Amino acid sequence: PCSRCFARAIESSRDLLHRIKDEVGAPGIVVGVSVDGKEVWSEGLGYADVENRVPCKPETVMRIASISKSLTMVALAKLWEAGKLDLDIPVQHYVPEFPEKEYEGEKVSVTTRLLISHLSGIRHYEKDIKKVKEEKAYKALKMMELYLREKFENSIESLRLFKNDPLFFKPGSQFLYSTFGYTLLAAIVERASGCKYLDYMQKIFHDLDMLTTVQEENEPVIYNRARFYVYNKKKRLVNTPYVDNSYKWAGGGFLSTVGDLLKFGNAMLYGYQVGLFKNSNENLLPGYLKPETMVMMWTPVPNTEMSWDKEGKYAMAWGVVERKQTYGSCRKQRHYASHTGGAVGASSVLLVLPEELDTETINNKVPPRGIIVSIICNMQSVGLNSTALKIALEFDKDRS
Amino acid sequence: PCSRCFARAIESSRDLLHRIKDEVGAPGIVVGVSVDGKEVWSEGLGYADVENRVPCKPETVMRIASISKSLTMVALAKLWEAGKLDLDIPVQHYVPEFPEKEYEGEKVSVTTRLLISHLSGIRHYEKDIKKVKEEKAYKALKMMELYLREKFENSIESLRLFKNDPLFFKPGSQFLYSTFGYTLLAAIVERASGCKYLDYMQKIFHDLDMLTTVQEENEPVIYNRARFYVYNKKKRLVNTPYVDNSYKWAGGGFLSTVGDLLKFGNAMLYGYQVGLFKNSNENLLPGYLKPETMVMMWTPVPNTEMSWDKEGKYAMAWGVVERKQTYGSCRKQRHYASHTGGAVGASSVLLVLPEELDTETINNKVPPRGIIVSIICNMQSVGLNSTALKIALEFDKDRS
Amino acid sequence: PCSRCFARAIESSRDLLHRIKDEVGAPGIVVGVSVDGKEVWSEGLGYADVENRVPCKPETVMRIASISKSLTMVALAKLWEAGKLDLDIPVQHYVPEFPEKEYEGEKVSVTTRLLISHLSGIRHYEKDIKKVKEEKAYKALKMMELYLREKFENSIESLRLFKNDPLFFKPGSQFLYSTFGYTLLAAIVERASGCKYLDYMQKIFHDLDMLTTVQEENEPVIYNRARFYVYNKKKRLVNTPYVDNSYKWAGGGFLSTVGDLLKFGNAMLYGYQVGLFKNSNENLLPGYLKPETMVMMWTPVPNTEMSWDKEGKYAMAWGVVERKQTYGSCRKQRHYASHTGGAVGASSVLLVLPEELDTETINNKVPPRGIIVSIICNMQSVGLNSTALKIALEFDKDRS
Amino acid sequence: PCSRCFARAIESSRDLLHRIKDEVGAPGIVVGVSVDGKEVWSEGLGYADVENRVPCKPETVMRIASISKSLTMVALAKLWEAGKLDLDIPVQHYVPEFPEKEYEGEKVSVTTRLLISHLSGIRHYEKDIKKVKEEKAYKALKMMELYLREKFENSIESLRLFKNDPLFFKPGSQFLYSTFGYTLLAAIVERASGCKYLDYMQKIFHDLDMLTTVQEENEPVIYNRARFYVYNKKKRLVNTPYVDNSYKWAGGGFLSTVGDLLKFGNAMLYGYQVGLFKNSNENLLPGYLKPETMVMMWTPVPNTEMSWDKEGKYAMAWGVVERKQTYGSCRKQRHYASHTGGAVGASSVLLVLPEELDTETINNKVPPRGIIVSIICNMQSVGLNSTALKIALEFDKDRS
Amino acid sequence: PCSRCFARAIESSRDLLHRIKDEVGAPGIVVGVSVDGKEVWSEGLGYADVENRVPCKPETVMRIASISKSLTMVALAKLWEAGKLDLDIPVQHYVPEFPEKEYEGEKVSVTTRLLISHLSGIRHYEKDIKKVKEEKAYKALKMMELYLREKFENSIESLRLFKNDPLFFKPGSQFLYSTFGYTLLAAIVERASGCKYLDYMQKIFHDLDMLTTVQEENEPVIYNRARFYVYNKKKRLVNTPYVDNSYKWAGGGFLSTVGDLLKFGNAMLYGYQVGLFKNSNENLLPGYLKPETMVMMWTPVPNTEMSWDKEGKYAMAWGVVERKQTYGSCRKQRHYASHTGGAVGASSVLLVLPEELDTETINNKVPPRGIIVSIICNMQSVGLNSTALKIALEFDKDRS
């Protein structure tokens, strides 16, 4: 009966996946979805490796990009729950190597909270400050290094790329997406925890049963590793140039499968929703994080912009769209959290759709309720947020 | 046993089709192959219409381009066999509307034979004579209107586009591929036969059992008609702009399926090979064209260039590669004839691979022997000659 | 009957291949053999790609190394037959960019013949002249950059690596294997022919029917491309680090399959043996190279050393062992030519075993007679010369 | 139907075996698995003897190492059930030859229970106490003779190697893996039982139907005996030097096949699970050991470390991982027992995966339920625990 | 198995029926097909009566038009077999009421054979002889009353409409389709047989089991009688004006269902094919008509034109296309007989597709072999010949 009921939504999801794959022309794509904490459908299309004629499989491993930032935020929250990390203390307390910076001749300080929400003013890959300022001013008026090859031994050495770069804007003033901030966050994690960042992340993965997740390293052998392709100026499929992501481990230097992302999403959803089911049953296992911490996360922050959805705002390393209803019989906004990551030669997305719970459902139902959708692709510059949202809505509607 | 033996080559052909489709990113592709005058495999991949989710089928209808030129040449040969057409007589005898032209102040004349081999010097879509001359000179040194919307009532009116254009080169001097020459050939056919060109072509199709072949007209309903797509500057799939091909009926204004192309190729092969099996059996039916005419066709012409194969030369509206062997244990050139046609939003190819016959095979075998491969695609600027050649070679090798 | 007779030697060859694979521990290996100009056996063992579980196939593509030097020598001989190249003229005539060099304050000149036999004194990857001199002196007494990543646009720019390096020894005095000499030879070929080296090599491959042979480039897609593996300090299989071979195109920057190597060997054997069968039949096709040129090649040069066989001497870009018989009932030396190439993460070998022809065999036999053996492996530092010789001897013995 | 259902998991297990064999480069490997007390799959890969070209077979005999310790523990438990052995009595009661030892000038005693769990402080092959202490201290801070040739006539004489060696740590204080402790245990068994250790072990094997199990002796003929290989400094396969294991009979001086290990595991599982099925049926045969004794075994001991799995603890001569579940939707720990043994030139593993039984399954099912996996290899320093666990999980999932 | 095999062709036939119905816009359509003398599929689409919302059914009764002419020819053949009718005798022998006519002042006579093939020159509904002559002359050069309301008591009185009309052309000279000739034929039948035409036709229907066939009369009640519709000048569906067909009983004044037409076609096919199966079995029942008479029928007559198929010729009240094959691998003409009838407000078609029989099929097969297709529509001016031919070809191809 579970599969019999879940026989129409799977077809529509497969049709949407074919539609987006044909629209973008990607060689292959893998989709994985979990319903109420239980995986119900996993499928792959196309070829993981065009040269060797390797078909896509649910066990295929690809890049995840911003999922690394999400996991870094999870590690930061775990450290903060232990009291070893303090958010508003200036970063120079933990990392004296970072020099003190002044904006417009004024003494300013940057905190971990500003770094999480990309409000510290740390520059992005773009170097010309004038171009960035002009673009931001134009956007405001309208509203009113990537291919590096060097390998970095330690996270501290990675700071050399941007330690001397002056701040583009005043801290906590303007939203500016950046990735070096997460490198600084990884350095903070290493300093506070006293252990290597990779070891801590591996321990977290083992605790979360995310076995297949691992960093990007060329020398070690990694099974079911796929390839990445781009279209050239002649509209012909070519291979992605080889790059090194040793300095972007917290900012996108990770690989994983759909199952690990589904497990991570289910764990996050359980941690969020456990704080409400406690009054109904005391036999439920405690969540991975305290409910207060989960409420602190996924909370929209003012003056932040959600790039892949204009209706939402940037939460703590997440994109959250709040429930909204303004006029009668008009558009009803749904509550969901998602993050889109785009690396070179690949694209990915992870979406969480919590269920709306009344006072009667929680009486005789398990705490983890919702839909988790994960889609990974081996083509760069692909937007999969809308497709994931549509698939999640279809599954929610078809849930018997 | 026939299908059991033809179980390995089909898999390899399908793999090659998938490879080329993924390399070019075409939404859909259809393949049709005939062995020894009998169709053995037809298959389609992708979606004929992305918007309406229509899968590709062997009955799908797409543009054919240069197959129209091939059929026009067939009609010209049929008229010439009846004695109503004379090749070397100047075209002004049949079409007085075409003005006499002089090159470098010298009286020159153009014949149908020059028009067939693209040696008359008639300009192509390019208008600047200086650019064409510079390109041809550069090519020689190295060796050493499309989106028109107007509908044309009659073929005579189509001459207005290029009747006043001066000749780019001396007739019969330099090879220059052009399509208006075939419009002039269609006018010649209408004048000589005394009937409409479309009626004559329809009669030829009915004789050749090519029922699904028809010209491109928007108003009439045509079943299983597909769509055409292009990639924009943002590497996103878009729709092909609407165009009118009333003036390019002989030059690419036709639609057909794989089966009709296979039938046409089989008929041409039978007409070519009937002249040799006559001494073995007098019960064989006569070919559609006389063997002498078939020998006159498919004969390479000097000073002509085969664009899609540097090892061949342009025959009479065909691309023929002659059998060649120069050194021992070196490359052995195979004998085959093919023509590649590329229109807006679509691409197609038709290849004929005659079999090598000894004095013993013809004693107890039917006259039509060879492999015919036809591939049609709904993506512009695609080269399918190599894939068709590989598929034909695979079938020839696997022929039990 | 041909396969029935060739049923015992194939088993022994497969057993020897398994033995060497287990002895070295290579993940995969591919073998290809041709008898009397006709391929009789092709087989692959292991996995081409351990990560994606891709089994080895006869169509697998791997590095060839010194086969590139052999092909460069073939191109040089082809140019010399046309009279455009003169061996003993100093290289400064064709390449003025190379500065004149003096040894021990004496004016000396280097010729193409010295470069071919590695007698010009050009340094190898080793930089310390003292160590090289000490090693050579120790060897005489006993007898009595690789991981570069930069891409080079043109062959002329590749000379920057060693244009200012002083000569280690007097030209034509001591044998010293080197690869930059073949880069200089490629520059000479480009200067003399007036065309790009890659275009000339592609034309040669097309003439020789070596379609799958192509240079090493990461961006273009190459089907059936394999991977390369090395053993680390912990005796665990790891991946080979990514390297660029733009400056070693003539010195090992090429990829090919077993079939192309077999075709090249058969062509060379036919060119060698055609000069003797001419008196018996005038219907034989001329060889790819003149018999006098083939006799000039494969001729041992004094003061040269064959690294992989102490019983032979270095010919013109080949390793030739002459027929020898000194005492009665003692070891009888066979005549064969072979070249072993070893790149990073891969190893390969190509062996030619000419047949001994009497005055009676040539009366009623085809000119190309002999055994060609080709073995390619994806493990570095592997010696496959002995295995190839044993397989060739087994096939020669078992030839009914 | 049993084989039809067991058609997918076998393929995955074979693929994993190939993967690990290629990763380590072992010449050969043998796998044997039993499902619910019935053997379902046995297979061998590679060559048992590279020199004589002997392929691996399920009947191949190799070293087992720590399986000897497991069998010694089984014999000790059997003796203890008869009341002839007392655990907490000092060993000097049974073996007066062992001198009394004092730690830090304090009278201390060692018991059989301490010896079983490696808590007696008996030194390992390492002789320098300072190095061992430094290594243990470093490990604690981070957390916060082999090639002997002499033959020993009797187990008592084997004590001469370590009878005078002072204890490294206080008894029952720190975990320290050692093998001489099991030699002392064998001496205890000989003293208490009054018969030879080998005779008692042979009787146990005969009772357990482990016919092929036998000690390592060069003089007697043993059928299907394999060879052992190591990689040298030049990454070339070599032969293992000849060694004598007369003093390590309880510590690794035994040989067996996969079938005997499967039978032993099935017997242990039946003995463990018989104590629960008694209330459902009185017709079941009694287990080889009392259920209370089986519960006493496989019980994790505090302050012990499981070397091959950080998630488990060292039980009585076993490695047991307890079932664990801390957070919701997080990693769920499975309950299993396994032991990994590594000798010179060979490696082996034995894993037991008990099934989770509810109150309904035991009503109509046989007592022995679970999966037993045994893997033996002829390459030293190989970790096969993860592969065995994955194979067992695959079989459990695929169990129809 | 019969229905399982006949599961694909039915779908294609239904699709074609939907296609033609949508193309013409008919309110309803009914199809009936018989395979090898056994009905296999009957279906109706749309509404028989739009006003009363009556869906179309296989039992729906509609007009048949030229099927009345076919039945009249059958009756004439039956009378001729009895010797009571003589073809070449002038009609004045049987019907003295018809005056003798002279063409161009020359004595001419008309026979029943001329009337059957429409060669007697009797005028059609058109009255202006000049227009008819001009149209026929134009057609030759290119190649090189309906709404009457009066009721007629007897067939003799019906001759008053055209008894005084002069002949348009010389008898037996030019083909001219007409319906008054069949009225004269009905008068001939009444005179020769001595009984009423309606009684004879009713007896024939009873013999042929065509129960539902009956003439068009308003007063009597006829069950399942449908309605007829036409499109007005405003492209809106309207009702067909009431008309009387008392004088067109032999020329289209009849109603029937699909089953009766299928039975009639099966009887005709059996009568045609019985003459060949006689030598194989003497137990077969005699056909309704002698085989010689059936051969005389369905025989193309020179100087006759088949209006609905240019590839055929008009036989005796039938349209027969002969088997033809002129060139190799060209169009192969199939042998079939069909007749299309078009009345006011309705259209119908009946097609017979005989099977090709070899010397082996007739040994162990029943005489009636072939496909019968009948389609009736309630929209005027509809051509259903092509659809019926396609359906018959599909059934023939799909016949297991």
Numbering used by the authors:
A (entry chain A), B (entry chain C), C (entry chain B), D (entry chain E), E (entry chain F): 99 to 242, 291 to 546
Task: Copy the relevant paper text.
In mitochondria, the serine beta-lactamase-like protein (LACTB), which is localized in mitochondrial IMS, functions as a tumor suppressor by regulating the PE biosynthetic pathway. LACTB is a conserved mammalian active-site serine protease present in all vertebrates. The conserved catalytic serine residue within the 164SXXK167 motif plays an important role in the enzymatic activity of LACTB and is reversibly acylated through substrate binding. Mammalian LACTB is localized in the mitochondrial intermembrane space (IMS), where it assembles into filaments to regulate the efficiency of essential metabolic processes.
